[PDB]
Each structure stands twice: as structure tokens, then as C-alpha cells.
């Protein structure tokens, strides 16, 4: 088999790409409800950590794939490991370093992450946590993300729309902040609800039949995830984490965070 | 309490953010009328200095928060200290260095500010003035800005508008240049007049009721500040300081400085 | 004769530029059907290599001329040389290095190409392959490209259109991926079909008469190439190589890859 | 008097700025018709040199003021000095280095200009020519440009228009290439014809009365310069120097080079 070597590694090599992602999203899934079993930290502390990683990604011009991978590493690590408040940010720093060295072409090194943490950790503390996360993750760094499923869904858009794609990615990142209602849904289901809600807002069209035959998810299958996602869109300006609404109000995303959300989804 | 360490420091930690800013904008307020008591410099000299700092911010891609903080440091320093003409620019250079090291992630160092001053000062002269400003400011560098109040007002916009937000920020920076009519108003009041004037120009809507219940400022409360702000908007092309109109004619701000100002505010 | 020295070298010096390109596009033409005679690699492997070079060009902000030249060097080298699977990517890496050092002002050096290959080759392996490609190409690096013919065609557009020019360049790069139906057409013919298909999609106008008198290609002359190019446009979202559709969905190209292709060309 | 030190030096210090520029544009004016007295070079060779400097400015992200100053240094130097073909490009290289060190904040150094010349000159050859140009120009580097007059004219636009300002700057740079019909006009007159032609094309409005009372130039006064400028706009796609049409087809200038020129100016 012929394969091209490169720096980005969160890509499915030649094999139906969508069929491979569905089989892998189940494996290495974060244990839902670990935050209740977590003694020191809570969901509100995780939402702040994930929101701070969004600002780190925007500072170093990191891809959206690097952000979703870092959040996947945090939830899986915290599901089987107990971390304190002061070390929680160290876990997120090392997780962002792992996702950068795995997906980015020119990733920020350890000295860069020590710099952005205002010199509160050492080069060894980040490397130890990075090595600790690797051992906990059993070195399985390839994980399907909401960004990966959204890319596959866009190939079936007829026609394509820049506002729909940008709004879908905006809704996808909002699910990373709140772990209470979204950690129980699969990345393919979250991307499906984000694609429909974005398409319904911009154009009014619904979940296309081409995606029904390809994914098997019907509109009723996505209805539970679509309900929680519709409320976050309505309560987005009131949410305490606003680093994603500021990110998606730029010309690069056609300012989709400024679009008014629908009052009713008619579902 | 859980807190995330970072480089930017002009941010209110978890505590109602708007209630905290209103209590702090009164503290460390610049003494109105210090320019009359200033023997050597005048308001026209300050307007040139502030306008030159806008060009410095655009040269190093500095945030708008860094600019407002630098102006806040200058007015407070000049309120209790007498500075000559030749040393006035040295004060603004050190104030911009303080605001950069306080808010920016990768701030320009001392060598950068000596470079942009065409090598008219030394590394010690900037560091001495920087240390002198810190002692005069009693190391209280956190100060509410017009940019901070505008960010809070945008969360209550229904719906949001990119042209209204950019025009509001444009009017906010124009108040920094002229100290004669705007140093007597609070940052929350200036941001309120800038938000209404921008909203009235683009869409015709007025000061929303959601901001009335949140801030307490009515349209009559903002009327004195709105009168002086409406004249600066009308006399903006005739003003001697045009570094802000050139800054806000770019695609990043949707070219709001080219929009025609309203002839009458109907107030 | 007066000539200005510079870094870019894929430019016709003063001499009718279009007449010179037509005479040179025939010389050093790739042998059609070499892939059938190629024992180890196939057309699907070449499509992946060319698609990976598009991502390399976007990573280093390389001009479109550098990409077309690299593909021209690969097809000519592979036409007279047999390469294995593992060395095929080494050929494309050296070809991209040659095109960069020939056209780019600040080209990526050998260390940059070794970096993007995930350190699978050495500095000598890239330099040896680079020297091997030069000897096979007889040091004739100047070759007319589809990008060069499109630039000449745009001067005769009445009026010019940003969407037509960007869509024409998008269709031009898609021909580089698939070598089976497009290696038998000349760059001037591919650019002609790409210009007409782009103009027909955006505005509905057809191949202008000003280009008929200048190039001699009529609409019937371009009809065979236009048929194969119309199918690639229709089957672009279904194609396995999507690095060009993602490249041309940016604001820099006015998002022409999101425009719906015509169902029938009426030819 | 209070003055702020900075890097850019082509700026009129506090003094009516438009009145100062009119008095200085006459001083140090290039001798019209020097090309006829020039034994070795011609106007077509100068047009290529000026067009190549436009590409140099776009490579290093240099301001439009730096380009106009470099052309002003070339015409004045060539008016009193005879230069050969091979040394003509060396003169333009040194002139661009002088204009960069005079106007730019971070200007390209001597090593940068030797690099872009494909290492055809030495560090001493550029420095000698730079020192030779300074002695010929009598160290008077401050000269009014078409860009400076256009900036003053935009303050009187009622209302302002982004397309009119970008098209005016596009027409202003085209006058720098052709020295035969434009070296006999003053920069204030060229900027006046460029402003009217741009305003007439986009909106249909004519030379405003506010600029008549400020500059004294009537539409009949600008008519001779407007005739030659209207033909260059019509014959712009046919011109041999196309580095400015490619520069002004970008989103930064709203793609004004793609706008269709008027058939008749109704004058």
C-alpha cells in the first residue's frame, strides 16, 4: 500500500472514511458522569479550562482539529484519573501540547506552553503531565472529532453554503464547553445536530436525505441532541464562556455568531 | 477558588462583571482639569500623543484594550505629576510599555519602544519613566476601559450587528484623543453614548431597554455625553488627529469610519 | 536589450507572450500513457501525490505557478524514469523543491521539505533526487503552465470578473490531480476550457470572440477537453482528492468551490 | 514647539497641510524631457523599472508612499545624471532603499535589496549608488506625492466611499509607470484627475465644489491631465506593465482594477 508521510496524524488513511470514524468514536469514549465522581473539580471548572484552550488555539493559529483532540484527551484522562484544582490547568496544558504535536505542522513547543501559563509550571511539570496523559490514554491519540464528522457531512451538501458550514462549526465547538448535556452524545450525533441547526437557521432546509442514507441518523434520532443544542444556541450570549462567540464573529467565519438563533426548531 | 493563569490581566476574575467595573471605574479616576494646572503641556499636545499611540498599536498589532489602558495611565500620571514637552512623549512611551506588558500576550519589549522613538531615548530613560509611572499609579494597573464596557453592552444586543459594534468601538477611541469634553465622563457613560450613536446610525434603533435595566443609564442620563460625542462624529474628518479614521476604514472594522454620521440625533 | 534580474524565473522576457507560450508548451511535453508503462505506481497514486503538494503549497504560501511547475516536472520525470512506491513521494518532494527555487522569491530550503516529510528522507536523498530530476529534465525548467495561459486570457475579459477568474483557476488545478483525462490536453486548451466553464457558470456568457482571434481555439476545438472538465466539476465533491476544494472555499478566492456546477453546458 | 519623533518622515509637521504640499511640489521637480536627452535608456525602460518596484513593494509589504518617493528620486536623479542600461536597475534599487529607510518603520536593509536583485550587485554597489543619489538630490528627501494629495482630498469627500478611494489610488500609481504623458503634470493635478475619474466611475458624481475652493483646480484646469489619464484607464489591460492591475484586484483594494472604465468622461 502507498502512503504519504506528513505531520498531521488525525486523518483516516485510505480504507469509506465515514464507516471508519463511526467504529472508532465508540472506542476510547469518555466515561459519562466522571465529574460527579471527581472529588475536587466540577463541570463549571472544566468549562473554563476548555474555554481557555480556545483562546490558546486562536493565539497560535491552531486548527480546529487540534482543539477537539485536546478536549478528547482531557475527558478521557479525567474519566480514569483524579486531578486537583491547581493541577487541572496543568492537565489541559499538557493535553493541548499533545494535540498540537499530533495534528499541527509547526506545533508550539513546551517552552511556548510554559510561557502562556505565565510561568506557573516548569518544563518538567508539563513533560511529566504529557507523559502521564500518554500512559493513561494507552498512546491511542487518534480519535474521531465533531470537526471530522462535519467535514464528511459537507461533501453531501447540495448545494454548499459558507454560512451553513461556519455556523455548524460554531455549534460544534460550543458542545465542547458544556460537558453536562453533550458528553453523553457521540461526535457523529453532535455534528448531525449542528449541521441541521445551522442549515435550518441560514436557509430553512432540514436534514438532507443524502445524509440519512449515508449515516442512518434520522431527524428523530438527532432530536434529543438537537434539543439541548438548540438551547445552548439560544442561551449562548448569556453563557459564562464567550471565547467561541468572539472567535466566530470574525470575517473568516462570516460572522455566524452574530446571526439570530431560531426561536423554534419545528420538531 | 479555581483561577486560570494567563498573560492578559485587564480581566475581571469570577465574581456580575458589570457591577465590578462600575465600582472600579470611580477609583483611580483622572483629575478633571489637570491640563489647566499643567504648566508646559496643553490638551492639543495630549491629543497628538494619544493619536501617535494609536499608530503604535496598529504597528505592533496591539489590542484595543492596551490602547485604552495606556491613555488611562497617562491621564492619571499627568494629574499628579508635572511633565515638560520633551518628556511628555517619554511618558506616553513608558505608559504604552506598561499597558503592553500588562495586557498583551507577546508585548513589545523596551528595545522595541526605543526603536519606534527614532532612538531619542535610552533603555534606562524608558525603564526609569516606566518605574516612575508605576510608583505614581501605586501599582494599580487594572482599570475599567470604554472597550470593557462596550463588550458587556454587546451581549445584550438583540440582535447583534457587526456594523454597530465596529462603529461603537470607533466612537469609543475618538473620546481618548479629545480630553477636554470627555475626561469628565465615566467610561461606562462614554461606552453608552457610543453604543447608542452607533446603533442609531446603522439601524435607527435606540438605547435598548435591556441595557436600561442592567446599567441604569437612561437616554436622558447619556444625553450630555451624547451631545459632545455627536459633534466629534460630525467634526471627525475636520479633526487634526486622523489616525483612528484611517484605522477604522479597514475591512476588519467593516469600514465604519466611512459611514455618514447622522445630522440630528432626535434627542 | 534591457532586462531586470529577479527571483521568479517562469516568466517570458520581452519578445507576443501568448505566441511564445504556445511554441514552448509543445516542447518538453510529458509522454501520454507513461502510467500504463509504469510498473509500480498508478494514476491513483499520482493523484494523491499531486493533492499532497497542494497542501504543501498552502502551508508555505507558495504561488500557484510553483504548483503547476512541480507537477510538470513530475510527469516529465516519470515519463522517462521508473520509480517505486516508496521513492515516488521523494520525487514529488524534490520536484516541489525545484519549482520553489525556480519561481518563489523566498523558497523553502531542503531542511523545510525534510521537515514536512516527517523526517523520512535525508538532506542528501532530497538533493540527490533534485539533481537527478534536473539531469532528466536536461535543466529545462521553464515550461508553460495552465496558470500562465489563464493570466493571458484574463486580459481579454470584457469586463473582468473576480468570480470567473477564481473559478477558472480552481478548474485549472483540478486537472493537475487527474492525469488520465487531462495529460492528453495542452495547457492552453485546459485553460481555455476552464475559462469558458467558469465564465458560463458565473455569468452565462460563452468563450469570447476576442480570445478566438487571439488563440485560434474555437468552442468546438475546446469541446473534447470541455467534456472531461465538466464531469470533474460535477464529480468534484465525490472525488477522493479534496485539497483543492478546501483551498478555493476561502475568501481569497471568493469561495468559488462552493458554487453549484452547471448541469448542462449546452454544447 | 512640540513634535513627536517617529520613523516615517514623509509627513508635514504642524504648520494648512495642503498649502505646504503645493509649495514643495514645485521645488525639486523632475526636468521634463530628460529621457530625450538620456543617451542609453528610454521611457519604455523606465516603465519596466517602475513596474518592477511595484512588485518589490508588494513583496515587502511597503506603503504606497514609499513607492511614490522612490519614483520621485529616480526621475530627479536621471534628470541631472546619465545612467547606462545595466546601471539603471542599480539606480532604482538604491532609490527604493532610500525611500524605505525614509518612510518605512521596519525597512528592508541593503542585504534584502541585494537578495531580490538575484545577487547581481554587491553591498558596496548599492551603498555607493545610494550615497550617489543622496548627493545628487542634495539630501532633500521630503517630496510631495500623489498619495499625499489623495489623502488630503479624501477628507473633503461627502460622503466617503471605499471604492472611490481605492480606484483613485489605482489611477495614481498608473501615472508613475508612464513618464511620457504624466511627468509634465504636478502631483496635485494628477491626484485631482484620479479623484474625479474614480468618483465619476463608481458613483457618477463629479469634482466637488469643496475641493474647488480648497485647491483652486477647476474641472477645466484638470481637463488636460484628465484626458491622458482617461486613456490609460481604457488602455490599462493592453499596457505592457500589469503589476498594478494585479495589485489592485485584491480584496484589500475592493478589486477596483476589475471595474469597467467609463467610455466617455462627458467633458
DSSP-assigned letters across all residues of A142-197: ----HHHHHHHHHTT-SS--HHHHHHHHHHHHHHHH--TTTTTS-HHHHHHHHHHH
Instruction: Report helix, strand or coil for C14.
Output: coil
CB burial of residue D262 (10 Å; 0-12, 13-18, 19+): middle
Residue D193: all three cell numbers together: 484627475
Closest-approach residue (CA) in chain C for A160: C258
Look at residue D3 and tell me if it is in a domain.
Answer: no
Whole-angstrom Cα distance, residue A179 to residue A46? 8
Which residue's entry shows cell 504648520? Answer: D15
Those residues with Cβ within 8 angstroms of residue B227's Cβ, 6 or more apart along the chain or in another chain: none
**Is residue C65 located within the same domain as residue C24?**
no
**Is residue A22 located within the same domain as residue A152?**
yes
Nearest to B45 among D2, D7, D160 (CB): D2
- In this structure, are residues B177 and B248 in contact, taking their beta carbons and an 8 Å threshold? no
Kindly provide the b/e burial profile for residues D85-94, where b requires at least 16 CB atoms within 10 angstroms of the residue's own CB: eeebbbbbbb
B176: closest CA of chain D, how far (Å)? 18
- CA torsion B241-B246-B248-B251 (nearest 10°) is 180
Those residues with Cβ within 8 angstroms of residue B8's Cβ, 6 or more apart along the chain or in another chain: B65, B103, B104, B105
CB contact under 8 Å between A85 and B5, yes or no, is no
Whole-angstrom Cα distance, residue B125 to residue D90? 41
Whole-angstrom Cα distance, residue D207 to residue D164? 12
Residue B127: all three cell numbers together: 525603564
Q: From start to end of C10-134, where are the E strands?
A: none
**Is residue B124 located within the same domain as residue B208?**
no
CB contact under 8 Å between B6 and A116, yes or no, is yes
Closest CA to B116 of B89, B134, B87, B98: B89
**Is residue C227 located within the same domain as residue C252?**
yes
| Mutant choice from B5, B9, B15, B166 vs A, greatest count of A C-beta within 10 A | B5
Those residues with Cβ within 8 angstroms of residue C76's Cβ, 6 or more apart along the chain or in another chain: C28, C30, C136, C137
**Is residue B84 located within the same domain as residue B155?**
no
**Is residue C130 located within the same domain as residue C177?**
no
Phi/psi at A30 (5° precision): -65, 140
Phi/psi at D3 (5° precision): -135, 140
Look at residue A11 and tell me if it is in a domain.
Answer: no
Whole-angstrom Cα distance, residue D20 to residue C193? 56
Which residue's entry shows cell 495561459? Answer: C149
Which residue's entry shows cell 518605512? Answer: D104
Contacts of A116 in chain B (CB under 8 A): 6-7, 105
CA A64 to chain centre: 8
Q: Which long-range contacts (CB under 8 A, 24 or more apart) does C227-232 make?
A: C228/C181, C228/C182, C229/C171, C229/C174, C229/C175, C229/C182, C229/C190, C229/C193, C229/C194, C229/C197, C230/C197, C230/C261, C230/C262, C230/C265, C232/C171, C232/C174, C232/C175, C232/C178, C232/C181
**Is residue B138 located within the same domain as residue B177?**
no
Closest CA to B50 of B68, B24, B29: B68
CB contact under 8 Å between D2 and B85, yes or no, is yes
CB contact under 8 Å between D85 and C2, yes or no, is yes
Closest CA to B183 of B66, B78, B39: B78
Q: CA geometry: angle at B29 spanning B136 and B113, to 5°?
A: 50
C211: closest CA of chain D, how far (Å)? 14
Residue C27: all three cell numbers together: 516542447
Instruction: Report helix, strand or coil for C136.
Output: helix
CB contact under 8 Å between B4 and A49, yes or no, is yes
- In this structure, are residues B21 and B63 in contact, taking their beta carbons and an 8 Å threshold? no
Contacts of D214 in chain B (CB under 8 A): none
Look at residue D25 and tell me if it is in a domain.
Answer: yes
Closest-approach residue (CA) in chain A for B155: A237
Phi/psi at A209 (5° precision): -70, -25
CB contact under 8 Å between B159 and A260, yes or no, is yes
Which residue's entry shows cell 473582468? Answer: C160
CA A2 to chain centre: 30
- In this structure, are residues A142 and A9 in contact, taking their beta carbons and an 8 Å threshold? yes
- In this structure, are residues D147 and D169 in contact, taking their beta carbons and an 8 Å threshold? yes
CB contact under 8 Å between C85 and A2, yes or no, is yes
Using beta carbons and an 8 Å cutoff, which residues of C are at the interface with A?
Answer: 41, 45, 48-49, 52, 55, 59, 85, 88-89, 116-118, 120, 237-238, 242, 249, 251, 255, 257-260
Closest CA to A225 of A193, A200, A179, A201: A193
- In this structure, are residues D207 and D195 in contact, taking their beta carbons and an 8 Å threshold? yes
Those residues with Cβ within 8 angstroms of residue A131's Cβ, 6 or more apart along the chain or in another chain: none
Contacts of A89 in chain B (CB under 8 A): 4-5
Residue B179: all three cell numbers together: 480630553
Q: Is the dihedral of CA B265, B44, B238, B53 positive or negative?
A: negative
Nearest to C4 among D89, D249, D260 (CB): D89
Contacts of B163 in chain D (CB under 8 A): none
Whole-angstrom Cα distance, residue A224 to residue A231? 12
Residues in chain D, total: 267
- In this structure, are residues B194 and B175 in contact, taking their beta carbons and an 8 Å threshold? yes
Nearest to D155 among B49, B237, B255 (CB): B237
Nearest to B48 among D4, D161, D251 (CB): D4
| Mutant choice from B1, B2, B64 vs A, greatest count of A C-beta within 10 A | B2
Whole-angstrom Cα distance, residue A54 to residue B235? 41
Whole-angstrom Cα distance, residue A2 to residue C41? 9
Look at residue C11 and tell me if it is in a domain.
Answer: no
Contacts of A160 in chain C (CB under 8 A): 237, 249, 257-258, 260
Instruction: Report helix, strand or coil for D127.
Output: helix
Whole-angstrom Cα distance, residue D114 to residue D107? 14
C226: closest CA of chain A, how far (Å)? 22
Q: How many distinct structural domains can be found in chain C? A: 2
Whole-angstrom Cα distance, residue C259 to residue C201? 8
CB contact under 8 Å between B237 and D156, yes or no, is yes
Whole-angstrom Cα distance, residue A205 to residue A202? 8
CB contact under 8 Å between D155 and B242, yes or no, is yes
Those residues with Cβ within 8 angstroms of residue A43's Cβ, 6 or more apart along the chain or in another chain: A35, A178, A179, A180
Look at residue B60 and tell me if it is in a domain.
Answer: yes
Note down the domain range covering D202. 16-29+143-267
Residue D23: all three cell numbers together: 509649495
Q: What's the reported resolution, in angstroms, to a tenth? A: 3.2
Whole-angstrom Cα distance, residue B206 to residue B219? 9
Closest-approach residue (CA) in chain D for B260: D159
Which residue's entry shows cell 518628556? Answer: B87
Whole-angstrom Cα distance, residue C71 to residue C178? 11
Residue B132: all three cell numbers together: 516612575
Using beta carbons and an 8 Å cutoff, which residues of B are at the interface with A?
Answer: 2, 4-7, 105, 155-156, 158-162, 251-252
**Half-sphere exposure at residue C211, Cβ-oriented, CA atoms within 13 angstroms:** 26
Look at residue A10 and tell me if it is in a domain.
Answer: no
Last residue of a domain, one of D110, D142, D174: D142
Whole-angstrom Cα distance, residue C98 to residue C133? 9
Those residues with Cβ within 8 angstroms of residue D187's Cβ, 6 or more apart along the chain or in another chain: D25, D144, D145, D146, D148, D149
Contacts of D105 in chain B (CB under 8 A): 59, 116
**Is residue A203 located within the same domain as residue A214?**
yes
Nearest to D260 among C5, C7, C159 (CB): C159
Instruction: Report helix, strand or coil for A132.
Output: helix
Method of determination used here: X-ray
Residue B248: all three cell numbers together: 477604522
- In this structure, are residues D143 and D72 in contact, taking their beta carbons and an 8 Å threshold? yes
Whole-angstrom Cα distance, residue C164 to residue C197? 9
Look at residue D174 and tell me if it is in a domain.
Answer: yes
Closest CA to B176 of B239, B128, B125, B122: B239
A 10 A CB-CB count for C205 gives 13
**Is residue D136 located within the same domain as residue D34?**
yes
Those residues with Cβ within 8 angstroms of residue B135's Cβ, 6 or more apart along the chain or in another chain: none
CB contact under 8 Å between C238 and A155, yes or no, is yes
**Is residue C147 located within the same domain as residue C267?**
yes
DSSP D248: T
Instruction: Report helix, strand or coil for A82.
Output: coil
Last residue of a domain, one of D120, D142, D164: D142
Closest CA to D72 of D186, D171, D152, D229: D186
Last residue of a domain, one of B107, B142, B177: B142
Whole-angstrom Cα distance, residue D18 to residue B166? 30
Closest-approach residue (CA) in chain C for A161: C258
Closest CA to D174 of D89, D238, D217, D218: D238
Whole-angstrom Cα distance, residue A261 to residue B7? 33
Residue A229: all three cell numbers together: 443544542
A 10 A CB-CB count for B187 gives 25
Look at residue A1 and tell me if it is in a domain.
Answer: no
Whole-angstrom Cα distance, residue A17 to residue C167? 28
Cα→Cα distances A18→A63, A143, A152, A153, A191, Å: 21, 13, 7, 9, 13
CB contact under 8 Å between B4 and A48, yes or no, is yes
CB contact under 8 Å between D159 and B85, yes or no, is no
Whole-angstrom Cα distance, residue C239 to residue C241? 6
CB-defined contacts A:C, below 8 A:
41
A17: closest CA of chain C, how far (Å)? 10
- In this structure, are residues B116 and B99 in contact, taking their beta carbons and an 8 Å threshold? no
**Is residue C134 located within the same domain as residue C179?**
no
**Is residue B79 located within the same domain as residue B22?**
no
Q: CA geometry: angle at C170 spanning C167 and C173, to 5°?
A: 155
Amino acid at each position: 500500500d502507498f502512503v504519504i508521510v506528513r505531520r498531521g496524524s488525525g486523518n483516516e488513511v485510505p480504507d469509506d472514511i465515514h464507516t471508519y470514524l463511526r467504529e472508532m468514536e465508540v472506542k476510547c469514549k469518555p466515561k459519562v458522569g466522571y465529574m460527579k465522581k471527581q472529588p475536587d473539580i466540577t463541570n463549571s471548572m472544566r468549562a473554563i479550562l476548555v474555554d481557555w484552550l480556545v483562546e490558546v488555539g486562536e493565539e497560535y493559529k491552531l486548527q480546529n482539529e487540534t482543539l477537539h483532540l485536546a478536549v478528547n484527551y482531557i475527558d478521557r484522562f479525567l474519566s480514569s484519573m483524579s486531578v486537583l484544582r491547581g493541577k487541572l490547568q496543568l492537565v489541559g496544558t499538557a493535553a493541548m501540547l499533545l494535540a498540537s504535536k499530533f495534528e499541527e505542522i509547526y506545533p508550539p513547543e513546551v517552552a511556548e506552553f510554559v510561557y502562556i501559563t505565565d510561568d506557573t509550571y516548569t518544563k518538567k511539570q508539563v513533560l511529566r503531565m504529557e507523559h502521564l496523559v500518554l500512559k493513561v490514554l494507552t498512546f491511542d491519540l487518534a480519535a474521531p472529532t465533531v470537526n471530522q464528522f462535519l467535514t464528511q457531512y459537507f461533501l453531501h451538501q447540495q448545494p454548499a453554503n459558507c454560512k451553513v458550514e461556519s455556523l455548524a462549526m460554531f455549534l460544534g465547538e460550543l458542545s465542547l464547553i458544556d460537558a453536562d448535556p453533550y458528553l453523553k452524545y457521540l461526535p457523529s450525533v453532535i455534528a448531525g445536530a449542528a449541521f441541521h441547526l445551522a442549515l435550518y437557521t441560514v436557509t430553512g432546509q432540514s436534514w438532507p436525505e443524502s445524509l440519512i442514507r449515508k449515516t442512518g441518523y434520522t431527524l428523530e434520532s438527532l432530536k434529543p441532541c438537537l434539543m439541548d443544542l438548540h438551547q445552548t444556541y439560544l442561551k449562548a450570549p448569556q453563557h459564562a464562556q464567550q471565547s467561541i462567540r468572539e472567535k466566530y464573529k470574525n470575517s473568516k467565519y462570516h460572522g455566524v455568531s452574530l446571526l439570530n438563533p431560531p426561536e423554534t426548531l419545528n420538531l
